[PDB]
Write a protein that binds this ligand. Sequence first.
Ligand SMILES: C=C1CCN(C(=O)Cn2nnc3ccccc32)CC1
Ligand SMILES: C=C1CCN(C(=O)Cn2nnc3ccccc32)CC1
Lengths: 305, 305
Amino acid sequence: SGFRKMAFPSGKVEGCMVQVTCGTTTLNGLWLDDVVYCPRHVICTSEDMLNPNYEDLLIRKSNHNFLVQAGNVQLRVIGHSMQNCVLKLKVDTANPKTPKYKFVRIQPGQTFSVLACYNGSPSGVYQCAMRPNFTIKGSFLNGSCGSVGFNIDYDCVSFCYMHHMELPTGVHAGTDLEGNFYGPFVDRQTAQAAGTDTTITVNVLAWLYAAVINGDRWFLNRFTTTLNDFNLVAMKYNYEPLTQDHVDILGPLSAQTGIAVLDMCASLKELLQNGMNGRTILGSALLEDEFTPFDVVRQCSGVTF
Amino acid sequence: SGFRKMAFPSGKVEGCMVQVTCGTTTLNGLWLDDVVYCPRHVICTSEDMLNPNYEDLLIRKSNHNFLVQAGNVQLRVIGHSMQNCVLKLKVDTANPKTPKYKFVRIQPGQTFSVLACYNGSPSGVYQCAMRPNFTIKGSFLNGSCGSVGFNIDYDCVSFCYMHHMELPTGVHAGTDLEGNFYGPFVDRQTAQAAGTDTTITVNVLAWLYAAVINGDRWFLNRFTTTLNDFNLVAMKYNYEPLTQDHVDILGPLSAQTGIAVLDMCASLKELLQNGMNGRTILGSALLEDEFTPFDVVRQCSGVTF
Ligand SMILES: C=C1CCN(C(=O)Cn2nnc3ccccc32)CC1
Ligand SMILES: C=C1CCN(C(=O)Cn2nnc3ccccc32)CC1
């Protein structure tokens, strides 16, 4: 028992990380098979950053200008292409450490692990969620660009995120591995509206179920509610609307604990309206929304990779 | 910017994990060079668990009774020895994936990453602290025994923890890699007092500095205090006493931010006496004590391995 904000084991991703340098700028790349993926802004300079003309900047570059290093081994670049906001550098060697992998574009509210890297070397790993407004609340310093987010299912790494940008608000933005930003963002050093965020309701409910499974039980009450009534409360507190698809994905947790989903919604309603009265749930004094129902079942059942 | 509960990249430890089976019981072992380390209670049965006679149980076992499997490769056991609460199984093959490593016995209040495993396969990685009372608040299911905690410095893994036991209170206990428990605990299925825990004061102060560096600033006040006055408050709220050695290890954070350690203590004093008035610091509504001053500097400076 016990419940922690657990990340996927990072070893399979660590073996894919490389350093990419283009002129003065160094960032991280992801070496899968014979292709290295990295953010296109490796080709910018500081005069470029307010609104880079990436097509014009890239036309000035040749294969031999992209320096790619994997530990101490230098990779030979035999082609380069810009796809959306990522650069794809073809190399003459397939990565011997390539795992089974997929590229996935995740949905807001889903979670993944980030392997933060600098100069192609791993620094740390943590779990986070894609906010409803498509930002992530990460831990990224200058030079972390090209660090990736991922999930693992059995032996397969699903890469879902590559880091590109810290907005002036201090939150983070990035792309899928085809280089398409999540959210309205562009790779320019500018203030960019993120727009209204909300709390991921289905994840809070999943975490309340996690709490019950682990014996934090004090917030269970004698009440129930309806999906309609609950959603009027969710709106008031800037929670995502709960749908029947969410109720369905909470089914396994409802079955395990015996607590109907709408009864758990009534506990959440009371916590939103009354607060946590100085108490804690699973070591937290706020309502946690970075565990999905799948996360809770995986952690509570010991699934391995 | 941003601040997360970050774990070390787990790849170097993943390559050391094996499954050990002795009779009916399977747990995890750590394969370093030509030795596999695992909890001695792999040799027990359920009739054994209230007070196993480990010496008598082990005398019934021979090398060929310890089944050790690394992925699909079976290891040949050529010797076995009990050291404190760990078994050391000599194998005829050195692990080709052995990292540079050390065994360390950590001090209460220090932090480390745990790689939770089942059947020799990694499930997840998370960061935690050794509580002042030598328990850890982990996430461990049955079969996670033999999972290890560790830190990494440059290319060297310092193994500090092997998981053995969940106390009936739901908190966790384990050993260093010489098999000595942290705390008063024994490997018996019994209620065992853990005794009074406290909050790790130097870590809370480190995290308040992390907060300022990241721009959460609202708890800074116009006050200062003395070490004596602060420790009278710490005692009242079951915080560890602050010593000058702690003030010294906070020096780099004090220098970075310009906030004297005793001024930050006065902010902490006010938060202990008044609470956080419905506000948050770094995404938390309580005072966080699982980051050491070294953790904060590492994360804020991008140190890699
Ligand atoms: C053209 C752009 C937009 C601006 N930009 C970034 O913000 C890069 N970045 N990413 N995370 C960071 C964390 C700290 C400092 C900088 C960071 C570079 C690419
Ligand atoms: C003789 C003993 C003492 C009792 N014991 C354990 O508690 C093993 N254990 N460790 N973490 C666990 C989490 C869930 C269930 C069991 C767990 C086995 C060794």
